């Protein structure tokens, strides 16, 4: 059954630390504990491995990433920027 109404993974913190602080920790704990899809083998098996380290259990491949997500919006922006720059330099 649905055990909690809104605390989710932050139910371990009880009544401590403030609800805004627990809601702020919640969105990043869900992200860092989520399984992500491997870019290399297509399976959704990528775990977090001491933040910034995103390891796929199958195929044993490790990607440097964000602290709580495998990819950040800034890094996706940077890949698009380097892709555009490389395409306009070597063409």
């Amino acid at each position: 059954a649905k055990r909690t109404k809104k605390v989710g993974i932050t139910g371990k913190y009880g009544v401590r630390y403030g609800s805004s602080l627990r809601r702020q920790v919640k969105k990043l704990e869900i992200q860092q504990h989520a399984r992500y899809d491997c870019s290399f083998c297509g399976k959704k098996t990528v775990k977090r491995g001491a933040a910034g380290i995103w390891t796929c259990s199958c195929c044993k491949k490790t990607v440097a990433g964000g602290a709580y997500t495998v990819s950040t919006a800034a890094a996706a922006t940077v890949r698009s920027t380097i892709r555009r720059l490389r395409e306009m330099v070597e063409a």
């Binding site: 990043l28 709580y68 800034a74």
Partner: protein
């Protein structure tokens, strides 16, 4: 009349950094002939975690150009760099995330990391997790490159100084509350002894310039001169302004 806590930090006894569990100094490869005239290919073997450092560290193996052996360089891992990826370092390397290039051989608006201030100091700028350097100008005559630093500072450095394409991995790390004193305890346990911090207004006058009194208050201005001496610089040193950023 007692030597205060920030004056005790320079004696370096119990305020040294805790360096047992660190992997080694993260540096660029040495600026040799291969990087100066062509490129060299290394291999990411491991992406490991460095204690005290928010950013993961890449271990990149290069072939030694002059002896038959392998050189393991320790890089700060850029986001998207993966194990088994080839890394190319040199003047002729391509614009790929993880590649090490001189800044003169790199276009404008390019995001770089682990940037040498001077060519051959093996990485100085934009090393913390999530940080990067924008390339904002080139002056080819008497070769210079204008860069933007993570503090917003404009800075002219040499075109022969090398950087690594991409942002530093580990970004967003300070976006989480620690929530509790133990997480700050374990954070600082492998950095250095700088936590917990007792306030100077909570001390006796012998311990701090802010110490003493029948209420905890400062009593003189917290803004201290740049031309003040040790024992006096306890507050907001050489403040151009104070207060909230409100207009």
């Amino acid at each position: 009349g007692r030597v205060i806590r920030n004056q005790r930090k320079g004696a370096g006894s119990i305020f040294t950094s805790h360096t047992r569990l660190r992997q080694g100094a993260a540096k660029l490869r040495t600026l040799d002939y291969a990087e100066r005239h062509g490129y060299i290919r290394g291999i990411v073997k491991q992406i490991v975690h460095d204690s005290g450092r928010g950013a993961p560290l890449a271990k990149v193996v290069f072939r030694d150009p002059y002896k038959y052996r392998l050189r393991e360089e320790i890089f700060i891992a850029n986001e998207g760099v993966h194990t088994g990826q080839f890394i190319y370092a040199g003047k002729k390397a391509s614009l790929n995330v993880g590649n090490v290039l001189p800044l003169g051989s790199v276009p404008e608006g390019t995001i770089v990391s682990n940037v040498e201030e001077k060519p051959g100091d093996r990485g100085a700028l934009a090393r913390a997790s999530g940080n990067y350097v924008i390339i904002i100008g080139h002056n080819p005559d008497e070769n210079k490159t204008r860069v933007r630093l993570p503090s917003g500072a404009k800075k002219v450095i040499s075109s022969d100084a090398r950087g690594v394409i991409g942002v530093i991995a580990g970004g967003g790390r300070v976006d989480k509350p620690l929530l509790k004193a133990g997480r700050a305890f374990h954070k600082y346990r492998l950095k250095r002894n700088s936590w917990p911090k007792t306030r100077g207004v909570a001390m006796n006058p012998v311990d701090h310039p802010h110490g003493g009194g029948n209420h905890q208050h400062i009593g003189k201005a917290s803004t201290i001169s740049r031309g003040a001496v040790s024992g006096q610089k306890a507050g907001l040193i050489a403040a151009r302004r104070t207060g909230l950023l409100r207009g």
